[PDB]
Write a protein that binds this DNA or RNA. Sequence first.
DNA 1: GTGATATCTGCTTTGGGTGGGTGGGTGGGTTGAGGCAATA
DNA 2: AAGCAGATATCAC
Lengths: 607, 205, 373
Amino acid sequence: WGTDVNVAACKENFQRFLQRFIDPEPLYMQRLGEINVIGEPFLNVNCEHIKSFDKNLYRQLISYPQEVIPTFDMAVNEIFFDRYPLEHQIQVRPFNALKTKNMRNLNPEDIDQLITISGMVIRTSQLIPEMQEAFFQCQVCAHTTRVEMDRGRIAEPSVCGRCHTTHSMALIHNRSLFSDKQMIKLQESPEDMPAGQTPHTVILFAHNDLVDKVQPGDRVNVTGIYRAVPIRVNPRVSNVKSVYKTHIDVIHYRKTDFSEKRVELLKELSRKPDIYERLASALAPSIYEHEDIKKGILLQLFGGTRKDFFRAEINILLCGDPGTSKSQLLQYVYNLVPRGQYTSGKGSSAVGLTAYLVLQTGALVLSDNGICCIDEFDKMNESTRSVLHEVMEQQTLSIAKAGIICQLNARTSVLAAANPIESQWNPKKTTIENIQLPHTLLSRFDLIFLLLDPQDEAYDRRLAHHLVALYYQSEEQAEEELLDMAVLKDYIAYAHSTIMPRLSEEASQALIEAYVDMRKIGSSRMVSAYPRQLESLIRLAEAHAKVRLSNKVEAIDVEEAKRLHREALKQSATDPRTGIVDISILTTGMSATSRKRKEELAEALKK
Amino acid sequence: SDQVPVGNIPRSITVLVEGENTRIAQPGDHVSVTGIFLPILRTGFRQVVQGLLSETYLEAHRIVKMEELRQIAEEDFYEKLAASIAPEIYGHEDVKKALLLLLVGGVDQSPRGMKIRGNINICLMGDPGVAKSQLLSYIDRLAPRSQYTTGRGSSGGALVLADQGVCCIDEFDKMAEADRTAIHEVMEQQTISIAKAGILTTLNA
Amino acid sequence: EVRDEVAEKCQKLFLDFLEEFQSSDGEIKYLQLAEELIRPERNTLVVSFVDLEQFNQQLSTTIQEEFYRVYPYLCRALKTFVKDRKEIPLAKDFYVAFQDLPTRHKIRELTSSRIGLLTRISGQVVRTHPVHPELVSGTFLCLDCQTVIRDVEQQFKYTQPNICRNPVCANRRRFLLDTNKSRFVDFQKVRIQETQAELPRGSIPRSLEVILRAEAVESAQAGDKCDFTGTLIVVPDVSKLSTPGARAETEGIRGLRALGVRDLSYRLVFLACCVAPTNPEQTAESIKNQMTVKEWEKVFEMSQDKNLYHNLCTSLFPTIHGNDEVKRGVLLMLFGGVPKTTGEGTSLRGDINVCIVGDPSTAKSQFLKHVEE
DNA sequence: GTGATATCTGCTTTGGGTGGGTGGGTGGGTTGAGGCAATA
DNA sequence: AAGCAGATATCAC
Ligand SMILES: Nc1ncnc2c1ncn2[C@@H]1O[C@H](COP(=O)(O)OP(=O)(O)OP(=O)(O)O)[C@@H](O)[C@H]1O
Ligand SMILES: Nc1ncnc2c1ncn2[C@@H]1O[C@H](COP(=O)(O)OP(=O)(O)OP(=O)(O)O)[C@@H](O)[C@H]1O
Ligand SMILES: Nc1ncnc2c1ncn2[C@@H]1O[C@H](COP(=O)(O)OP(=O)(O)OP(=O)(O)O)[C@@H](O)[C@H]1O
Ligand SMILES: [Mg+2]
Ligand SMILES: [Mg+2]
Ligand SMILES: [Mg+2]
Ligand SMILES: [Zn+2]
Ligand SMILES: [Zn+2]
């Protein structure tokens, strides 16, 4: 072999490295102790440490990884068995903290050398079995033999040892020994790409415990050996092309993006009198002065109680003029939730809402037990509207296509954003006629909010100052906001984990009286409420109880739910002509005054 | 294009590059290649089946890509530079000034080094024959990295090649919905998202 | 001939288990089930793994660790256990299924270390393929000496005898397949997918190929969520392999004689012996028979109740207040009329249609949902 | 003198349209123009 | 040109 590698000297040097190196008790001695405690036989070693201690050992590791790494394994095994008298022997995984190469600059001089590259995973293959030891059985005497694989070639026996028959040994594929392999496609990082060039892609091969350690979408630093392999002209001939193909044999992956103390902090927050407003403020610091919308979105994030007999999910629609902060709110909620999806109602959209050989479930099914953010709600076609109505009413999605008949669970909360059909919101027009959506679909939303653009000058000045301040915000404030967001996420996770509020007797009486009063308002003069709204109240009440980290729904929760529902209706249920109390616009899609006027017109034309 | 004979289609040649002549040429550059014109050797049974005809290639040997100044910068330089945009066009003084801003493009970073969008978007709406296409054609020739496209000349790519550049969209109201969605997302996120049967990918735009 | 000690011991112990294992009632549990295997359409016996674990833990462990190796011997033991009854032809083949495996694995846990072991998985069926006959043991005639060779095993590829049985004969290339004395099994290929519950967050679904055999064919439908019990195996690239009777048809391992200068790759498929749903000619007498005694007396009491119309109405729709007439109508729809056919071949409808016109939020959707559930 | 075992000989391959659309597209090949059903 | 199937003469023991 053309290598200046003496195995014994390398092993001794590496054992010396483990014994004496100190991180600026040897660090890797502590690592071996932790290995014994945990039981995972993998030792990661930073190549920078090896370089610092020994520049020859580092140089040999980089130049001849295939020869040198096994000697490192031998050294670590010997040392570890001395210090602590395990399913497998420990395996060293040298790695570089930072990439040493760009995917675009890989060269022939790097073949069979240890390199580190950064990238984003796009595809991973299913597991590929590799034969390590073949199993043969004589087709006459049943005598069995085992042959070790040698550089991808197997020495098939020619004569049975026991009975001496020739050409009688058949390979039993499923009695052999196999190991795992996986193909991964790594895409060049957007930052390192030259301007205007398409991303480059590289092939990686992972084996044994490194399979399935990355998923598509991951951003990773990969340390491995650069390989060059010949390509056959066709499968039948032994001719090869003079230009070789390349891949990387993965050696190390680095993914580059409750505690009792944490629970104590969360409970301490939950004890504070104004936890509701604190969480609401933390929800979206950038948006300005949309307090009730933020409170509703917080309650949607917490959700109501899963009774398991009843949708427990809270649906919110934000309709308003263009140039407001609707998309920003949807983005902030999408970032916050763990199982959320951000999508658009337009059909041309990259990510679809509908389920469509591989069965592909849409965003609504993917957001099951989560929140689906739908940005261009008004731009949905009729089929998408039917799908959304089915999801919101039944919490399931039925498919009968290509011989597949099934029902998919979709228990998802919809946060939707809507714009008017005109260039601006029309005060003369109601909500239904401002946004061209069926009233049947609108009646499935618990809360509808209106984000109108004021004509006030003082509002313009205040918003301008807000935006300028944000344009000049400092890094410490941004970090503080990030910490508050993390606290909010942990609080919501804990509440979902351990809190299941239930209705107390006083809450029940409060809800019944609330519904009766809402009905009375209309009954005094029309109808001012319908039973579905009562259900909404219950959900909201439960959500509020969950914010306090309380297992009992109290009267305060009911009062808050009533206030929020009454504010949303006052925002979105107002008839531009006369007043608000009329909810017939939601139930029938036509204003009561409009209905009377149309009746008059029809009667007159009938005259 | 200017060298193709009348009523013909441009031809192409294959260039094989080795060693230190690599990484010199990129798509889109104008190059002068010195090399050797050779036939492609077949192999195996394909030698026998194919006759006396051969494909060709060029074996690359050399690839070649193809205080007065302060005084010009010192005085009334904004007016002078704007007036120099398409001088053969008359009367669009303020539009020409706006197009110069689109070329410099505004500051890309916040005061703290955070990345912010500097690119400036302009739309020229007007009645026919007011030199809209002439102005767009001029900006394409001046811009170092740019792509000119028509509403129906291409659909379903030019944006990627125009990254860090200028994308001149002529006949902007003739495009389809799919093309409109792509333009909308570029003016929002400065990227293009594609989905190959569920395999997502994001490109810089 | 060399003898596989482990497999023979497993066969003997499995025969003992089939003969001796006792149910709660004191009868032999599987004798009465094997008694059903006299029918031509029945060839599979379903055995609970918990019963086997109770009977003999070492046997259960050996079966779990060497399932692929020992399964033919378990089938032979079943054949012996059925041999007594006269109605079975000597040519019939019998197969064993294993029902209740306590532990479950995920589709992404199917690694090389699981090859040949007994496993249980869950998945959603995406596609089903047509049923085929698959050769398991071929009978061949030797053209040189006219000797009949039987029980030639097949390994993923159409295989002919290696050497003629006759000691005097030296033939290695010329044989004739006789279909009528060969043994075939029903074969079906299905493609399944990860369930939405199992699919990791932000991950493309992983698909798997499952092979059903004998009775298991046509028992899973696309869109169903099913539990499969069986084993994970490797299937070689058949297209690369050349045999005396079968030429090769247009990296991996090298060096096999059947390979020439070619490479052999492998792919993982699941060989399922049992299929079940993940979440589980009629006449009045048969309906009664399907029921237990308690259920039958409950049905009779219901039939005798003099307030049955009202009790049924209230039981079906408990969440709805009022609207008794609507409940009565929906109940009558559920019971239905008598469909009839005329002498000339035309049909008289017997089904009942009902319509509910309602104001908003009046619980008509509640009626539809109650009926649907 | 029989059992390997080394040498020699003849077949057909390739994907391709002079090898067919009276083989078949579940055996496998971009680009455009042309009928459908559902669509708006 | 490249490679497998078949035929056949040839060394060795
Ligand atoms: N209330 C507000 N608080 C903070 N920023 C606001 C507010 N209203 C408008 N803005 C500013 O307006 C821009 C928000 O535009 P955004 O994309 O969120 O709008 P949108 O409501 O989704 O509307 P559309 O899609 O119709 O343009 C940002 O500059 C944001 O700073
Ligand atoms: N102000 C002008 N100065 C010089 N040439 C002009 C002027 N206005 C129009 N032209 C000439 O008129 C012809 C038409 O101009 P051009 O094609 O750019 O118009 P346009 O606005 O793009 O039209 P359309 O809307 O029909 O596509 C060109 O030759 C252009 O040179
Ligand atoms: N008579 C009733 N008894 C009990 N609950 C009722 C009654 N009427 C309405 N409800 C309540 O109203 C809700 C049922 O609304 P549902 O969706 O079924 O209405 P709908 O008739 O389909 O109307 P729409 O389609 O306009 O929404 C549930 O809360 C149900 O409890
Ligand atoms: Mg928006
Ligand atoms: Mg023009
Ligand atoms: Mg309804
Ligand atoms: Zn043998
Ligand atoms: Zn014979």
